[PDB]
Structures are given as C-alpha cells and as structure tokens.
Motif scaffolding. Structure first.
Motif, PDB file in Angstrom:
ATOM      1  N   UNK A 193      -1.500   9.369   2.400  1.00 14.86           N
ATOM      2  CA  UNK A 193      -2.431   8.601   3.210  1.00 14.86           C
ATOM      3  C   UNK A 193      -2.637   7.230   2.582  1.00 14.86           C
ATOM      4  N   UNK A 194      -1.792   6.283   2.977  1.00 13.57           N
ATOM      5  CA  UNK A 194      -1.781   4.958   2.370  1.00 13.57           C
ATOM      6  C   UNK A 194      -2.913   4.110   2.943  1.00 13.57           C
ATOM      7  N   UNK A 195      -3.896   3.793   2.100  1.00 11.20           N
ATOM      8  CA  UNK A 195      -5.088   3.050   2.519  1.00 11.20           C
ATOM      9  C   UNK A 195      -5.571   2.077   1.444  1.00 11.20           C
ATOM     10  N   UNK A 228       0.833  -1.200   0.000  1.00 14.11           N
ATOM     11  CA  UNK A 228       0.000   0.000   0.000  1.00 14.11           C
ATOM     12  C   UNK A 228       0.873   1.258   0.000  1.00 14.11           C
ATOM     13  N   UNK A 233      -9.160   1.263   1.746  1.00 10.51           N
ATOM     14  CA  UNK A 233     -10.580   1.341   2.081  1.00 10.51           C
ATOM     15  C   UNK A 233     -10.921   2.726   2.622  1.00 10.51           C
ATOM     16  N   UNK A 234     -11.968   3.336   2.070  1.00 10.76           N
ATOM     17  CA  UNK A 234     -12.373   4.690   2.453  1.00 10.76           C
ATOM     18  C   UNK A 234     -13.158   4.695   3.764  1.00 10.76           C
ATOM     19  N   UNK A 235     -13.311   5.883   4.380  1.00  9.94           N
ATOM     20  CA  UNK A 235     -14.298   6.020   5.449  1.00  9.94           C
ATOM     21  C   UNK A 235     -15.706   5.954   4.859  1.00  9.94           C
TER      22      UNK A 235
END
Ligand SMILES: CN(C)CCC=C1c2ccccc2CCc2ccccc21
Lengths: 351, 351
Positions: free
Chosen positions: B276-278, B226, B280-282
C-alpha cells in the motif's frame, strides 16, 4: 409473432447476447477453442485460475521461490489451454502479467454468466429470441429521447470529458438508455442520502453487459488476488469518458462500444496518489479517489437528480506527484452503486 | 593522547567510520568508483536520481514499451554512473528494478553523511582520531553492563525472536549500548505517553549508522518515489530480530553487524495485509502495522520503561491471505521514534 420492442433496444439485445462475439473474445486472448470450447468453460475453473494467481501473489512477497512461480505459471496455461502458434506464452512472474490475467478472467466470468443465462431459463419457440433475452436481463431498458435535456447533459458530459492524450479515436452518442435493474432501487436505499454523490462512467467489453445488467457490477470473487487490481477488490469508475471508453477494449473490427453512467455513493474519499491494494477501508472512509493531474473543471459542476455531474473540461489540478494521469473513484461495497444510463457509442479511429 | 572511552565503544566507532567498508558497500550496488567515487558524492546528485526514478515509476505503471523507457533508464545511469562488467546497460523496467535502486540511494544518502562528517570537522593530531569522531555523532553512547536486568531482557528478546525461515544463520550478542541522541527526547515529549508504545528492531547496513546516529532515523525525501517501498515513505520496523537483522546485509566476508532498539509510539494502527504505497495516513491513524502471519506471543509481553516489550516465542497470528510472514511496523512521523539500545552481533553462519 416477432418482437415489438423499440428498434435500438433490439439491436442492443443481439449485441450482448452474441455468440460469435464471445468466441472471438476467447480468440483475442489466444485461447485454444478445440481443447477448451465455449461449452466446457465453467465458473469454478476460473475460481481455480484465480487461486493460481493468488498463489503467485503470495509466492512473490512471501519469500523467494521463483522455481514454484514457473510451475504455477505453467499450471495456469494447463488450466486454461492456449494456442499461441509458435510464440512463447507470456511468463507469469510479476505484477504486470498478474494484473494482465485477472482482467481476462473477470471477462471470462462474465461470458460464462452470459452463456449460462443464454442456456438458462425456459424454451419458448413461439416467442422471439429478443423478447426472451430481454426478460432474462431483469432490466427495464427505455430509449432516451435525444431531445430530453438529460440527453443534452449526457452529450455535454461525453463531449467535454474526452481527454486529449487518448487521441486514437473520437466519440459520439448512437443510443442512450434509461435502464432500471430489478432490486437495485431498494439495494441503493441506505446510501441514497449519503453526502457526495456523483454520476460516473463504467466502461466494459460488449459481451459482459449480459452479466452486468442481470447481476449488476460486482466486486472480484474471494478467490481473486487483491494485487491484480490496482486499488483492490472494489468497483472502478472514472469521471472522464475516455478513460472508461478504453476499458470497452474497442477494436477496428468492433468499433461500437457500450459504456454506463452510474450513481455512486462515495462520501469520504480516501484520497490517494499511487497503488494501494486492499480488501476493506478504515473506519470512516467509504470510498477511494485516485487523484490525477488532469480533472473535470470544478466550477462547471452541476446537479441533476440532486447528484453531482462534473462535465467541465480537462484542467490541470495542481497535483504534485501521481502514477495516474486521470481521476478514478472506487467503492468496495456493491450496494453503493445505482446504474442509470447505458450508452452505445461510436469510435471513429484516426489515420 | 590515547582515548578515555571503553574498548567496545572504540571498535564501534571505527567500524561504522571505516571508509573501506563504505567504498566496499558502493561496489555491491554496482556503482563505478572511477566515474562516481566516494569523494565526488553530494546530496543533490542523489536527489536528482530520485526524481528520475520517480519519472520511471510512472513510465513503468503506464506500460511504456522497452523502446520508450530506454531513455529514462539511461537518464538514471547518466546521473549515477555504474560499473557493468562489459555489459549493455541493464534496462530498468518494473517494480523490483525501482525497489532495488531505491534501497540503493537510501544508503548512498546515508553514506554521503558519513563521508561528509569525517571531512566536515576540525582535525588535531594531539587529540584521538576516535574521540574526535565520537563528537561528530551527537550521541551519548554508554556500554550496557552484562548483568543489569535490561541486558537480560534484551538477551531473551533477541534469543526468542529468531525466525525459523531465517535459520540459515544464527546470531549471538557481542556488545550492547544504551544510547541517547541530543534533543531526541525533546522530540518525543508529545508522544511519550501515547497508547501502544513498543520497543522494536531496526537493522541497517553497517556503513549507514554514522548518519542514523547523527541525523536520527529518516524518511525518504520529497524527490523519492513512493512505489520503491512496500508501504511508501516512512520509518520501517520489526518485532522479530532476524527480520531486521537481514537488512544488515552481512555475509561470510563481513559477519559483523549492527542493529537498533527504538521505542515507537504506534497508537491507533492502520493494519494491512498487502502493498500500500502512500505518503499520508487516513485520519485518526498514527502508525501502520503490517499484519504478519507470525506474531510474538501476546501473553508473553512485559514492561520496561512503561513500554510494551514484545519478547514471546513465534506463533501463528491466524491471518488469511497476507503478504507478510512477520509483523513489520511503519510510522510516518520522525517524532514517534526514540532510540534506546544499539547492539553489535556476530552472524554465525552455516557456511
Ligand atoms: C538507514 N535506515 C533509514 C534504514 C531504514 C530501515 C530498513 C529496514 C530495517 C529493518 C526492517 C525493515 C526495514 C525497511 C526496509 C529497509 C530497506 C532498505 C534499507 C533499510 C531498510
């Protein structure tokens, strides 16, 4: 007269209000005490240092000006005169060295706060140095009776949540304290009946506690860089005592460590696995949780104060993929924290 | 028999399928074509490398020393052998080391497809080399007429949104292609009426397009790390044309390039300033918009296909402390992309 406060409380006072600890800390960061003594340290000097770090943060992402990156890195060491002897000062050219320095500055800020609180206030020679400094902490500090089941709980917290991998030491509770900082009872009110409240640890270097008890735990200043703190400008906790216990930065010379238990109003945790630098959260989430492979066992969770105390053994949550070994929870508003218990600990290192 | 297609479409097919361009692109990534030739590639070979990168990602973030991380860096080179002049194998031991080798594998995967398609088919000496390869793309490419207002819309959108920081070269339009991949409009049905839909730039290396037109745009696999991308695994974009054009990675030796124009259902946007390594979103969020320092004039937007086409001049957005000079948009769901126009551009340099 002489101090009539509890004996371990007196010991605690002389620990955080310790000059030679403070001067030793600056030397651990290999700083020139001749060019920059403890006296000439200041608040804005650090804010400027932070801006130098903020500069490099932008400098790396906003284009490729590696020339300037040196001149700012060199400017940092000019700002904070160091004395490495013959060795090269570590170049500030990447996320690692960036992160590295902010932690120092965060500590420097707290030392300035401490020594400013030492020279702050009133001259009263007829009293004892201990009673004076106690009253400057703005904190009622009670010794917890080692019988009290809350102590036993606290012991069962530390006892079980020592992680296997951090093998360099083992722990035991020397002194527990029921701290009550002035105002925080009212500051914490709006998040008192917010759901999902957990008692968590905050580990820190001995000397910082002067600032941490007078002014509480704080978010990094406006000047600070968001990239310097893995999840950003918040306040960092852990459920494992060993994780926070490392942030005590205990040594062979300084084996005694101080660590805090704190009631944190988490609520909706922004469950994350890797780094994500931010200043604020989306409309909905109130905190972050970095998910780790190991974690306190959930079936062993309990409720003291109507608050969760996950003191189960380290178990492998089936966490596919993560940069973190162990959990950590982060809130980004200072009112969301209420400090509870301060624990003096002993680190017996292995050989 | 010779081809029925237009000349511009024929030169387009040849360009992306030119094997020598693929062979060449692999050399820029320091790949040894002796030990790892174009023919000996495979899907899992690359996905195996991603797993090892993902293993280094943790090795790097947890500060494992140069003697420890040694093994993992060589493990990567073991899988994908490299051509290092006469050097010692360079140590992979930071973010950029990863980020660079991540953007490599993306191509290696996209190139694999191109080579896989050329070979995974039925040959016929009577039929045209081109027409047979056009079939493989599953794309209804149509040459846009130079007059049609949609051409003039694009010309200006390209003309205005050339950034001043990327002025070392200057672009001009050669060809424009209205395109429709098979089934892609079926995928868009849920999102076609979503609020905030825009047309945006997406420029990749010449050699990748074969796989992009075949498979559609793609997010990185499960195996991938990620931390290789600024905002994790997704589908990146830009509203400035020069920004996307930079990832065509043209030069004086290869001034020809390609770039897309995709409709994007942004919807509710998770605005961000920093890495911002992700994966899946909020909840509630659909896309991510990186908050750029520069923005296409808000009042200079227009509608084509009921979609928000942002073709203004460059202005300051008025954002403090951001890592992005310009807006880059990232969606995390293949379904929110619909391809509309593909342009061929001459990158006229200032040598
Ligand atoms: C083949 N396809 C999937 C390429 C993806 C798209 C891009 C791209 C294009 C334009 C603007 C931003 C980005 C994001 C970064 C990036 C890094 C390396 C290679 C390609 C890309």
């Amino acid at each position: 007269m002489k101090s009539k406060l509890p004996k371990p409380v007196q010991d605690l006072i002389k620990m955080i209000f310790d000059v030679e600890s403070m001067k030793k800390a600056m030397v651990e960061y290999e700083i020139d005490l001749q060019k920059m003594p403890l006296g000439k340290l200041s608040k804005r000097q650090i804010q400027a240092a932070y801006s130098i770090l903020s500069e490099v943060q932008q400098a790396v992402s906003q284009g490729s000006s590696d020339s300037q990156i040196l001149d700012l890195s060199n400017r940092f060491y000019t700002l904070i005169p160091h004395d490495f002897g013959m060795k090269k000062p570590p170049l500030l050219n990447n996320a690692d060295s960036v992160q590295a320095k902010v932690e120092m500055l965060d500590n420097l800020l707290d030392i300035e706060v401490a020594y400013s609180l030492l020279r702050g206030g009133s001259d009263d020679s007829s009293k004892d140095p201990i009673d004076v400094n106690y009253e400057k902490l703005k904190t009622d500090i009670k010794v917890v009776d080692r019988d009290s089941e809350e102590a036993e709980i606290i012991r069962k917290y530390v006892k079980n949540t020592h992680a296997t991998t951090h093998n360099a030491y083992d722990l035991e509770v020397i002194d527990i304290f029921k701290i009550e900082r002035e105002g925080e009872c009212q500051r914490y009110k709006p998040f008192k009946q917010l759901h999902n409240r957990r008692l968590l640890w905050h580990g820190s270097r001995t000397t910082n506690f002067a600032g941490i008890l007078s002014q509480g735990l704080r978010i990094a200043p406006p000047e600070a860089p968001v990239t310097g703190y893995m999840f950003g400008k918040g306040i960092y906790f852990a459920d494992m005592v060993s994780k926070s216990a490392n942030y005590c930065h205990t040594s062979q010379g300084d084996p005694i460590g101080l660590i805090l238990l704190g009631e944190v109003a988490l609520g909706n945790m922004y469950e994350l696995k890797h780094a994500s630098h931010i200043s604020k959260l989306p409309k909905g989430k109130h905190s972050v949780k970095g998910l780790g492979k190991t974690t306190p066992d959930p079936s062993a969770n309990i409720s003291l104060d109507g608050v969760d105390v996950p003191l189960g053994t380290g178990i492998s949550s089936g966490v596919n993929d993560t940069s973190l070994l162990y959990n950590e929870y982060i809130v980004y508003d200072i009112a969301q924290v209420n400090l509870k218990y301060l624990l003096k600990l002993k680190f017996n290192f292995k050989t």
